[PDB]
PDB file of C-alpha atoms in Angstrom:
ATOM      1  CA  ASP O   1      72.230 140.532 232.367  1.00 21.29           C
ATOM      2  CA  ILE O   2      73.457 138.450 235.313  1.00 21.64           C
ATOM      3  CA  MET O   3      71.331 138.464 238.449  1.00 21.76           C
ATOM      4  CA  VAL O   4      67.742 138.006 237.255  1.00 23.36           C
ATOM      5  CA  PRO O   5      68.807 135.390 234.659  1.00 25.81           C
ATOM      6  CA  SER O   6      70.495 133.282 237.339  1.00 28.05           C
ATOM      7  CA  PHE O   7      67.448 133.336 239.610  1.00 26.75           C
ATOM      8  CA  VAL O   8      65.117 132.489 236.729  1.00 26.05           C
ATOM      9  CA  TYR O   9      67.402 129.546 235.980  1.00 27.85           C
ATOM     10  CA  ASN O  10      67.151 128.456 239.618  1.00 28.26           C
ATOM     11  CA  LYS O  11      63.348 128.581 239.407  1.00 29.61           C
ATOM     12  CA  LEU O  12      62.981 126.346 236.351  1.00 30.71           C
ATOM     13  CA  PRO O  13      63.307 122.889 237.980  1.00 30.79           C
ATOM     14  CA  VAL O  14      60.744 123.416 240.741  1.00 30.90           C
ATOM     15  CA  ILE O  15      58.200 125.058 238.437  1.00 34.25           C
ATOM     16  CA  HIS O  16      58.647 122.246 235.923  1.00 33.62           C
ATOM     17  CA  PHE O  17      58.132 119.683 238.682  1.00 32.10           C
ATOM     18  CA  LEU O  18      55.041 121.404 240.082  1.00 30.33           C
ATOM     19  CA  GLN O  19      53.422 121.830 236.667  1.00 26.32           C
ATOM     20  CA  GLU O  20      53.985 118.163 235.837  1.00 24.39           C
ATOM     21  CA  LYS O  21      52.189 117.240 239.059  1.00 26.20           C
ATOM     22  CA  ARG O  22      49.380 119.666 238.236  1.00 26.18           C
ATOM     23  CA  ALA O  23      48.968 118.052 234.817  1.00 24.90           C
ATOM     24  CA  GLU O  24      48.905 114.590 236.390  1.00 23.08           C
ATOM     25  CA  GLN O  25      46.341 115.901 238.869  1.00 22.82           C
ATOM     26  CA  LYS O  26      44.084 117.002 236.009  1.00 21.24           C
ATOM     27  CA  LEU O  27      44.361 113.611 234.304  1.00 21.65           C
ATOM     28  CA  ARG O  28      43.662 111.812 237.579  1.00 20.32           C
ATOM     29  CA  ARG O  29      40.523 113.880 238.162  1.00 21.81           C
ATOM     30  CA  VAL O  30      39.393 113.166 234.595  1.00 21.97           C
ATOM     31  CA  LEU O  31      39.664 109.425 235.200  1.00 19.44           C
ATOM     32  CA  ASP O  32      38.068 109.600 238.651  1.00 20.51           C
ATOM     33  CA  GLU O  33      34.870 111.185 237.279  1.00 16.72           C
ATOM     34  CA  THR O  34      34.215 108.260 234.911  1.00 16.90           C
ATOM     35  CA  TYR O  35      31.694 105.672 236.094  1.00 15.09           C
ATOM     36  CA  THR O  36      29.913 103.032 234.015  1.00 14.74           C
ATOM     37  CA  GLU O  37      26.214 103.951 233.890  1.00 12.35           C
ATOM     38  CA  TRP O  38      23.816 100.995 233.724  1.00 12.85           C
ATOM     39  CA  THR O  39      20.287 101.766 232.540  1.00 12.34           C
ATOM     40  CA  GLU O  40      17.109  99.919 233.520  1.00  9.42           C
ATOM     41  CA  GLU O  41      14.393  99.107 230.984  1.00  9.24           C
ATOM     42  CA  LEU O  42      10.815  97.950 231.503  1.00  7.36           C
ATOM     43  CA  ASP O  43      10.800  94.179 231.874  1.00  7.42           C
ATOM     44  CA  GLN O  44       9.061  92.462 228.971  1.00  7.38           C
ATOM     45  CA  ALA O  45       7.145  90.105 231.276  1.00  6.28           C
ATOM     46  CA  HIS O  46       4.809  92.930 232.296  1.00  2.85           C
ATOM     47  CA  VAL O  47       4.271  93.590 228.588  1.00  3.13           C
ATOM     48  CA  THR O  48       3.462  89.903 228.121  1.00  3.40           C
ATOM     49  CA  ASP O  49       1.030  90.073 231.052  1.00  2.44           C
ATOM     50  CA  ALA O  50      -0.769  93.152 229.719  1.00  2.65           C
ATOM     51  CA  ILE O  51      -0.960  91.394 226.347  1.00  2.00           C
ATOM     52  CA  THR O  52      -2.643  88.410 228.003  1.00  2.00           C
ATOM     53  CA  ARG O  53      -5.087  90.587 229.948  1.00  2.00           C
ATOM     54  CA  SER O  54      -6.087  92.452 226.784  1.00  2.88           C
ATOM     55  CA  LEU O  55      -7.049  89.082 225.273  1.00  7.34           C
ATOM     56  CA  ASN O  56      -9.644  88.733 228.099  1.00  4.04           C
ATOM     57  CA  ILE O  57      -7.963  85.487 229.212  1.00  2.00           C
TER      58      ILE O  57
ATOM     59  CA  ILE S   1     -16.943  65.265 237.504  1.00  2.00           C
ATOM     60  CA  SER S   2     -20.082  63.637 238.891  1.00  2.00           C
ATOM     61  CA  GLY S   3     -23.222  64.551 236.978  1.00  2.00           C
ATOM     62  CA  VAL S   4     -23.992  64.242 233.276  1.00  2.00           C
ATOM     63  CA  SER S   5     -22.693  67.431 231.704  1.00  2.00           C
ATOM     64  CA  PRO S   6     -25.017  69.086 229.162  1.00  2.00           C
ATOM     65  CA  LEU S   7     -22.419  69.944 226.497  1.00  2.00           C
ATOM     66  CA  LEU S   8     -19.192  68.536 225.092  1.00  2.00           C
ATOM     67  CA  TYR S   9     -16.162  70.829 225.247  1.00  2.00           C
ATOM     68  CA  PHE S  10     -14.944  71.483 221.727  1.00  2.00           C
ATOM     69  CA  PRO S  11     -11.975  73.823 221.281  1.00  2.00           C
ATOM     70  CA  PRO S  12     -12.907  77.469 221.892  1.00  2.00           C
ATOM     71  CA  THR S  13     -11.961  78.383 218.321  1.00  2.00           C
ATOM     72  CA  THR S  14     -14.689  80.757 217.130  1.00  2.00           C
ATOM     73  CA  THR S  15     -12.466  83.445 215.595  1.00  2.00           C
ATOM     74  CA  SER S  16     -11.594  81.207 212.664  1.00  2.00           C
ATOM     75  CA  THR S  17      -9.707  84.024 210.900  1.00  2.00           C
ATOM     76  CA  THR S  18      -7.317  85.899 213.218  1.00  2.00           C
ATOM     77  CA  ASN S  19      -4.298  86.995 211.194  1.00  2.00           C
ATOM     78  CA  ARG S  20      -1.006  86.726 213.064  1.00  2.00           C
ATOM     79  CA  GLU S  21      -0.027  90.133 211.668  1.00  2.00           C
ATOM     80  CA  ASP S  22      -2.904  91.896 213.433  1.00  2.00           C
ATOM     81  CA  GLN S  23      -2.098  90.162 216.722  1.00  2.00           C
ATOM     82  CA  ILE S  24       1.571  91.162 216.473  1.00  2.00           C
ATOM     83  CA  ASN S  25       0.552  94.721 215.602  1.00  2.00           C
ATOM     84  CA  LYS S  26      -1.668  94.989 218.681  1.00  2.00           C
ATOM     85  CA  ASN S  27       1.095  93.472 220.811  1.00  2.00           C
ATOM     86  CA  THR S  28       3.422  96.129 219.388  1.00  2.00           C
ATOM     87  CA  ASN S  29       1.054  99.039 220.028  1.00  2.00           C
ATOM     88  CA  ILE S  30       0.506  97.895 223.617  1.00  2.00           C
ATOM     89  CA  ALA S  31       4.260  97.406 224.008  1.00  2.00           C
ATOM     90  CA  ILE S  32       4.995 100.926 222.757  1.00  2.00           C
ATOM     91  CA  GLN S  33       2.326 102.491 224.979  1.00  2.00           C
ATOM     92  CA  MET S  34       3.650 100.770 228.104  1.00  2.00           C
ATOM     93  CA  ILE S  35       7.253 101.700 227.293  1.00  2.00           C
ATOM     94  CA  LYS S  36       6.290 105.336 226.732  1.00  2.00           C
ATOM     95  CA  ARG S  37       4.454 105.426 230.063  1.00  2.00           C
TER      96      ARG S  37
END
């Protein structure tokens, strides 16, 4: 009725602070894993060159 | 260009009928093949 309740009350602020940091840590890691991915596609000039060769030019 | 040439150079047009659609279909097949490779 008295003792355990008081010590639970004492624990609340630190646990709240640590869990807020843990949540921020998760969000930070989520952002850090994001990285714009640029793709490379076959240049059309080689297509235009193969087109020309096929013509027997 | 010294020397009388034997022939006059007319345009090389001999394929009088070459539909643009066929040419742009061959270009497209070649394009697809190269992209797939």
